[PDB]
């Protein structure tokens, strides 16, 4: 809600404020996919 809306670029700063969001937005949604899947898995499998 702050990365992607700020990634509505304009002009010569097209891929400047765009790429410094969407790149890390894929990193955010894949860390949410890695926190909903796999991190729950290995915590139960082996920890103590």
């Amino acid at each position: 809600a702050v990365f992607v809306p700020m990634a509505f670029f304009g002009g010569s700063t097209g891929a400047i404020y765009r790429q410094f969001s969407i790149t890390i937005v894929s990193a955010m949604a894949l860390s949410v996919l890695v926190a909903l899947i796999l991190t729950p898995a290995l915590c139960a499998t082996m920890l103590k």
């Binding site: 809600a1 702050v2 990365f3 992607v4 809306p5 700020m6 509505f8 304009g10 002009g11 010569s12 700063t13 400047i16 404020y17 410094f20 969001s21 890390i24 955010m28």
Partner: protein
């Protein structure tokens, strides 16, 4: 203190980096030669070699070609510095190297040589700096456009003013040798006007005649004259064109030698003639103010003279116009998403004022050191809104 540390914090676009490679352009006065500018390119090569052995690895000079355009006045030297390991301190990095090149050479010497770091950026995006241009929108010529351009440059530096630094792009203006060929004198003795035009054209300027073959490939064939017979204005009479009545006729018979004042570069913007002005903002002012206080000076000039902003800049800038709208929808979507998983009218406001909590710290580190509000800093802000939203949402989720 958060508003005070933001407005006073200045605005760049992207920091000018050490690239391990820079350059330095040359520019000689009216009607300089290839031999004159070669002396200037030699002295520039000395500073980088003998006086800078540790920092520079190799120079690549080029006589008669600047980034302004072309001609035997200009020059350029592509510097290629040693690797980053052999250059340790801040003295051995690009910023310090080109600093003692300018105010040193400038003042001394005779020509104008600068040196400058390569903009990572592009051609545009200097920040606190503009690119103006003045148009001839009526039937006045180039001579009258020169007077209006001198009146715009004058009044700009006449009252600074929270200053405005301004110079022309390169319309120096140098003299040209005009040759008036009287048409009645020519046909009287019996010389064709065709023959006279390709005598002067295929001798002084050169002429593309035909193609030949050299060692397998195919190249060109040119025709001109030995160097000494086309240097001075007195050597025009040395050429003799033949007439229909089988006898020689000198150039001095029908010609008339006389000097004039033209320009070696006629710029034209959008189907009309123009003159580029490369100006800039003050240390106080910044872009928006400098541009609107150059428009009321542009409308104070004679008739048939308007303006059009040429020409890399811009289409809605970044620190300004854009940023406001981007952060505005960032608040409208943050508010809605904090509600889809909460259901209240109080929980989302807690996260909507941790924005200034983390932001004051980011403004403190940049303003304390020699950093500024650029691209890397503005995205470091939005990341800290995601880190302050995270921690605070844990304080709001587990607690509810």
């Amino acid at each position: 203190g958060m508003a005070y540390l933001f407005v006073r914090l200045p605005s760049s676009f992207l920091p000018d980096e050490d690239q391990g490679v820079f350059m330095t352009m040359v520019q000689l006065p009216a009607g300089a030669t290839q031999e004159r500018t070669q002396k200037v390119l030699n002295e520039v090569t000395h500073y980088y070699l003998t006086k800078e052995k540790n920092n520079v690895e190799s120079v690549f000079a080029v006589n008669g070609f600047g980034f302004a355009g072309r001609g035997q006045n200009t020059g350029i030297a592509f510097v290629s510095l040693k690797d980053w390991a052999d250059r340790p301190g801040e003295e051995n990095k690009v910023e310090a190297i080109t600093m003692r090149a300018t105010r040193a050479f400038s003042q001394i010497k005779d020509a104008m040589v600068f040196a400058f770091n390569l903009p990572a950026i592009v051609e545009l995006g200097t920040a606190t700096g503009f690119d103006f241009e003045l148009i001839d929108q009526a039937g006045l010529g180039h001579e009258k456009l020169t007077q209006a351009r001198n009146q715009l440059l004058a009044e700009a530096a006449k009252h600074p003013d929270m200053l405005t630094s301004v110079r022309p792009n390169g319309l120096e203006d140098t003299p040209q040798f005009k040759i008036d060929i009287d048409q009645e004198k020519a046909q009287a003795l019996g010389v064709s006007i065709n023959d006279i035009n390709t005598t002067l054209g295929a001798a002084w300027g050169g002429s593309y005649v035909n193609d030949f073959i050299d060692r397998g490939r195919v190249k060109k064939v040119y025709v001109m004259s030995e160097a000494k017979y086309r240097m001075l204005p007195d050597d025009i009479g040395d050429w003799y064109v033949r007439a229909a009545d089988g006898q020689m006729v000198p150039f001095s018979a029908f010609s008339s030698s006389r000097w004039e004042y033209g320009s070696p570069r006629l710029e034209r913007y959008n189907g009309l003639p123009s003159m580029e002005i490369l100006g800039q903002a003050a240390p106080g002012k910044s872009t928006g103010e400098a541009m609107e206080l150059m428009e009321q000076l542009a409308s104070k000039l004679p008739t048939g003279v308007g303006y059009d902003w040429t020409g890399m800049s811009y289409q809605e800038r970044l620190s300004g116009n854009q940023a406001p709208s981007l952060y505005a929808i960032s608040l409208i979507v943050v508010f809605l998403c904090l509600a889809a998983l909460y259901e209240s009218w109080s929980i989302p406001f807690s996260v909507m004022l941790v924005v200034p909590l983390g932001v004051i710290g980011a403004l403190l580190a940049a303003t304390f050191r020699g950093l500024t509000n650029d691209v890397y800093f503005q995205v470091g802000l939005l990341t800290t809104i995601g880190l302050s939203a995270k921690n605070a949402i844990l304080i709001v989720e587990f607690a509810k």
